[PDB]
Amino acid sequence: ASGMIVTDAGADQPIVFVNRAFSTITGYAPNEVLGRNARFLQGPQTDAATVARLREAIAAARPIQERILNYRKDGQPFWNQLSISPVRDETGNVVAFVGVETDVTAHH
Amino acid sequence: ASGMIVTDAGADQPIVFVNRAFSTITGYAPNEVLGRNARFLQGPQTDAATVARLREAIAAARPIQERILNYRKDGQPFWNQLSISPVRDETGNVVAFVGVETDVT
Ligand SMILES: Cc1cc2nc3c(=O)[nH]c(=O)nc-3n(C[C@H](O)[C@H](O)[C@H](O)COP(=O)(O)O)c2cc1C
Numbered sequence: 001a002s003g004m005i006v007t008d009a010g011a012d013q014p015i016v017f018v019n020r021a022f023s024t025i026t027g028y029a030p031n032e033v034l035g036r037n038a039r040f041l042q043g044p045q046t047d048a049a050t051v052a053r054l055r056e057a058i059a060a061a062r063p064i065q066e067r068i069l070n071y072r073k074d075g076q077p078f079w080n081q082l083s084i085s086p087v088r089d090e091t092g093n094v095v096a097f098v099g100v101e102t103d104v105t106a107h108h
Numbered sequence: 109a110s111g112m113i114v115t116d117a118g119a120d121q122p123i124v125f126v127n128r129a130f131s132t133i134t135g136y137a138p139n140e141v142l143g144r145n146a147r148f149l150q151g152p153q154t155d156a157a158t159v160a161r162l163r164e165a166i167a168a169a170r171p172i173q174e175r176i177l178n179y180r181k182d183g184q185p186f187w188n189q190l191s192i193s194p195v196r197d198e199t200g201n202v203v204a205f206v207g208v209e210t211d212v213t
């Protein structure tokens with residue numbers, strides 16, 4: 001099952017909702033992530049160029065897909081097939097961002 | 109500001125998240141709507157053909173926009189400029205639906 005993250009549109013995109021699969025994939029409970037920017041999923045082996053592409057796309061409210069190395073709450077790495085899109089009203093205003101996370105690590 | 113509703117993909121698309129503007133527009137608190145299908149916003153003068161187009165779009169996970177008559181908690185009618193889209197993973201599985209509601213009364 002794929003995770004879903006919903007964030008606020010503005011001011012560093014704090015998480016406002018995660019689905020159950022997000023907790024299965026990442027090991028974080030909703031309590032532990034609400035109000036935070038999702039960058040806490042990254043760590044030392046995360047590719048900086050990938051993070052830069054995400055940062056520029058989100059600032060521009062442009063959809064983006066990347067494979068990015070992320071980390072579970074207890075530090076276990078996983079590859080995240082990540083897709084982020086703005087949610088817009090019909091006037092084009094960004095209401096939120098939605099991200100889908102698929103664990104594409106062969107853990108076992 | 110526009111409302112946002114997030115639902116599960118299956119089992120009659122129960123609401124799992126609403127933003128602040130949803131409550132400003134509709135007069136419902138989150139605890140009054142979570143776990144329910146959004147159709148409770150409809151009422152006596154809602155256009156049945158519009159509802160049927162939404163039903164078919166959600167069944168097929170097709171993006172759709174409609175101007176639909178809805179009702180606030182206090183029973184006052186309002187025009188909802190509603191846009192719904194599926195949220196998909198890379199393999200095309202539907203993870204959720206997202207709806208944006210603009211009060212265009
Ligand atoms: C809706 C949404 C979901 C996100 N999900 C993830 C994720 O699962 N993993 C991740 O590494 N970054 C994720 N991000 C990206 C980070 O929040 C952040 O935008 C990125 O690290 C680039 O900005 P920075 O260089 O300021 O950290 C997400 C962002 C948004 C808006």
Ligand SMILES: Cc1cc2nc3c(=O)[nH]c(=O)nc-3n(C[C@H](O)[C@H](O)[C@H](O)COP(=O)(O)O)c2cc1C
Nearest residue numbers: 113115121145146147149159162163205206207209
């Ligand atoms: C994410 C989402 C948001 C929705 N928001 C609204 C809404 O604001 N107003 C409304 O009348 N129907 C809304 N609906 C539509 C109803 O939930 C339902 O799909 C529609 O009435 C057609 O199905 P039915 O014939 O089974 O009721 C929404 C549906 C989804 C999936």
